[PDB]
Enzyme design. Structure first.
Site, PDB file in Angstrom:
ATOM      1  N   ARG A  28      -1.854   4.137   4.983  1.00  0.00           N
ATOM      2  CA  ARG A  28      -0.894   4.127   4.275  1.00  0.00           C
ATOM      3  C   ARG A  28      -0.441   5.443   4.585  1.00  0.00           C
ATOM      4  O   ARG A  28      -1.100   6.256   4.492  1.00  0.00           O
ATOM      5  CB  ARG A  28      -0.922   3.920   3.017  1.00  0.00           C
ATOM      6  CG  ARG A  28      -0.941   2.323   3.687  1.00  0.00           C
ATOM      7  CD  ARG A  28      -0.696   2.148   2.076  1.00  0.00           C
ATOM      8  NE  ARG A  28      -0.866   0.240   2.293  1.00  0.00           N
ATOM      9  CZ  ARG A  28      -0.904  -0.821   1.557  1.00  0.00           C
ATOM     10  NH1 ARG A  28       0.015  -0.504   0.026  1.00  0.00           N
ATOM     11  NH2 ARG A  28      -0.979  -1.890   1.556  1.00  0.00           N
TER      12      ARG A  28
ATOM     13  N   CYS B  57       3.245   8.134   2.759  1.00  0.00           N
ATOM     14  CA  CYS B  57       4.134   8.431   1.793  1.00  0.00           C
ATOM     15  C   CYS B  57       4.845  10.100   2.661  1.00  0.00           C
ATOM     16  O   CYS B  57       4.242  11.014   1.908  1.00  0.00           O
ATOM     17  CB  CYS B  57       4.205   8.063   0.592  1.00  0.00           C
ATOM     18  SG  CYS B  57       3.955   6.146   0.788  1.00  0.00           S
TER      19      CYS B  57
END
Ligand code: CL
Ligand code: CL
Ligand code: CL
Ligand code: CL
Ligand code: CL
Ligand code: CL
Ligand code: CL
Ligand code: CL
Ligand code: CL
Ligand code: CL
Ligand code: MG
Ligand code: MG
Ligand code: MG
Ligand code: ZN
Ligand code: ZN
Ligand code: ZN
Lengths: 108, 124, 121, 108
Positions: B101, B103
């Site tokens: 992940r 971001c």
């Protein structure tokens, strides 16, 4: 439905590379990403939002190594306003989907 | 052609600027482009990103983790148009391993800082 | 109704950023007007955090009613319940649509830190 | 099938209040939440994880007013162990579903 509106904000469900016939679109991850974006376009418009009012996008991807190619397509649709936040997550997607995208957008 | 960037020495790790370990996971604080003498590193966003990665490596190692065990990276950036350059540096430290992940967020950063990064990593 | 806390004087780099129509606060901590950390339990600190949030929201042209997301940082997840008792006093009739709590290393003497995302009216 | 394991982490798919026969559980949001936790337990077990190795949970609900009731149940399964990250967010759930949970857990 394809999402929920709360307090002027549209929270979409994940859009997948599905054509209006119900087949997964033919071709590579870019082709799939283009179809995800056609599907997003329609749900955003339905909700009273647009590519220019997306504040956060989340890209679910089968393989993180394919992100650069998704991002090339992403930048064509978000060419006026890039969302202020975005996330990319490796996930198990539906059969033959390489990419899925959900958005959070302001409703005019 | 093979291209290398000379590795920056890390900032000194403060007792509240490192992170916390809970249940075998290390949650770093945001690392900013500070050098060993406590000032902002010289140069453009790529230089600042290299410094941030140096500082991350220091805090990961202190915590018993490494780049290979990072499962999430969050990049705080002054300007989203500078993402491509940050990501060019990101790919040099997360080359053989890409965190599952990541971001990116536009954020208000400390004076002169154009990038800050925090990580979550498995403690081996 | 809890006694309102006096907000800290928040510097230009601690008051967040507006991008297009949305205000993204920096993490607000239990700093008082005198520059020191609140001396008191986690509930008093949370009340301090909320007065600092109130001040940065108002300067951005936003309010608690336009917060669409809040993120709470705490040293120990066991403390969430007490922080949440205070959270519900400011977010009472309006509850932000997204809410997260995370364990984090906080600044010296801070038991709680909160960031919000809010629509600029 | 459901979720995915990457680099010692299990990322579950969202678990909803379906019984093993595929029927939506009878009763209030609390009963639904208990079913979601049975479903979570099964998929964590299959992945080689447990409630004790859950490092993040995300709760999806239709209205944020429902949260305190979901959290009463959450606290029963996450009692002496509390996941280090916890999110709650409004979403369009499946017909009759009041609650959905996805988790991230360490695979020992
Ligand atoms: Cl293309
Ligand atoms: Cl290095
Ligand atoms: Cl990973
Ligand atoms: Cl470089
Ligand atoms: Cl995450
Ligand atoms: Cl909201
Ligand atoms: Cl109180
Ligand atoms: Cl279990
Ligand atoms: Cl945990
Ligand atoms: Cl119960
Ligand atoms: Mg355009
Ligand atoms: Mg944040
Ligand atoms: Mg999620
Ligand atoms: Zn095409
Ligand atoms: Zn350099
Ligand atoms: Zn007080």
């Amino acid at each position: 439905s394809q999402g929920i509106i709360v307090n002027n904000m549209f929270y979409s469900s994940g859009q997948i590379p599905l054509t209006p016939s119900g087949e997964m679109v033919n071709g590579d991850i870019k082709e799939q990403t283009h179809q995800v974006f056609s599907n997003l376009k329609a749900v955003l418009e339905e909700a009273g939002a647009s590519f220019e009012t997306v504040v956060k996008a989340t890209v679910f991807i089968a393989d993180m190594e394919q992100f650069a190619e998704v991002n090339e397509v992403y930048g064509q649709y978000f060419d006026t306003h890039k969302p202020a936040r975005f996330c990319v997550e490796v996930a198990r997607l539906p059969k033959d989907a390489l990419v899925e995208i959900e958005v959070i957008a302001l409703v005019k």
